[PDB]
Subunit: 143 residues, 4 copies
């Protein structure tokens, strides 16, 4: 997964997520100014796929990140950053996934984030999972 955002000074920030071949844990690599370095997510969570990532800036300029992967039980895991720590989101453990999830997100005029996550399930069907601010639900998407 790759996600990026511009701060108020026009500096690009990159966050690159991958599954480490040597320990089965997600890696986060960060660029904030002039070099690559390790992110806090590194080595916290096991997965069995790569990760899809999306991010957004709130009205205060705080970055929010969401990372989606397949966990060690075959179900989608959601990892969240809002301020100062990674935590497992509400999506975690709800749905079986068979592919590296894709994700996109957008902010509406009220500052409510909307997220869409896409992954194959156990029946080889491409599914869309939707967040509009209350509960995850299965979307209308079909292949």
């Amino acid at each position: 997964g790759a996600t990026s955002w511009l701060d108020g000074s026009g500096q690009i920030h990159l966050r690159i997520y991958s599954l480490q071949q040597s320990n089965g844990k997600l890696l986060e690599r960060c660029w904030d100014s002039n070099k690559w370095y390790d992110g806090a997510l590194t080595n916290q969570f096991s997965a069995i796929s790569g990760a899809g990532a999306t991010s957004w800036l709130d009205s205060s300029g705080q970055i929010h990140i969401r990372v989606y992967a397949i966990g060690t039980d075959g179900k989608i895991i959601e990892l969240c950053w809002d301020k100062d720590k990674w935590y497992s989101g509400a999506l975690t453990g709800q749905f079986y996934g068979a592919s590296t999830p894709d994700a996109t997100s957008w902010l509406d005029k009220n500052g409510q984030i909307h997220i869409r996550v896409y992954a194959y399930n156990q029946d080889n069907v491409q599914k869309e999972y939707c967040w509009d601010g209350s509960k995850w639900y299965v979307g209308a998407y079909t292949e």
Copy 2:
């Protein structure tokens, strides 16, 4: 791959890219208001991986989309939309890829797009390919 943008009315547009198990060609599924439909990219390009996608809006409100996959020669293919047609971009055929590419992009203050594409290569090295408006180059990223 999933990408999305908001138009001037606050309507979300979704574009979801996937590799068809039946014919080895990329599918584009589109949402503009109230239903999913097959996009113009569908069946124009063969690949052997999934697709990473990024997009941006120019100052006129025109969407630009870039889609990255592994082609049938084992090399990264770049598919481009700027207005009314899909075409193969400058990145195509330069580098071997061994994983579904990730991509991100941002617009600088001068309206110049910057793109970063990430994929494993034939040597099992995670590589970053960078566009800043002239030529693709290998970036500083490492795991």
Copy 3:
């Protein structure tokens, strides 16, 4: 998948199974003496993985072949050859598979074939499926 056997004259026979990128159908490539040719299985069956294969010779010198793949519903499919046609075996549709299955087989003193098939399931557990001549059952194998 690859399987092979020696006939009574000491001639090698090779059978190589793969999933075609262009049509999502299994291909069988055959070697019996001096050239590769397309086997009868070719283009008959859709799958979403590669295929594992095993084979055995009965006391009359008749080859029997079993090929295992993930079907388009996410479940293991078994394709069988005993004499003159491919058919779907008893294993088909019983279990979810999340990996290209592996298979091995042996003949006991009474000429009864025993088959063992290994694949991850939807819960990311490596499973063994066993045939000893009556019904498929889940074996004692654990990772």
Copy 4:
């Protein structure tokens, strides 16, 4: 990968090779009589794919095993057992691999092993690599 052989008492021996999600090393699971156990190959070798396996019995009743995987440099690795140790075979490092290798083998009338290994290469071509007792060579196999 799965391989099996019958000893002189008619007892089945199973050897199941897999890539461990926890450490990126090959696991060998063994059945000789009444239980599964970890074999000596376990945790010796890193890989980035699953493993294909083949085995044969020599005239003394000694098993020989060959295991094929993609190593951490993107090239096929060959792991060999003839009596009492695993070692890297002559195929290791020669060819790029982009898929879990398949392998089969047969003994000719003189007791010379023949091995055939199949894997995609970096150019998305299915390749056959052949051993007849001197050097590995690219075979006539095509799709």
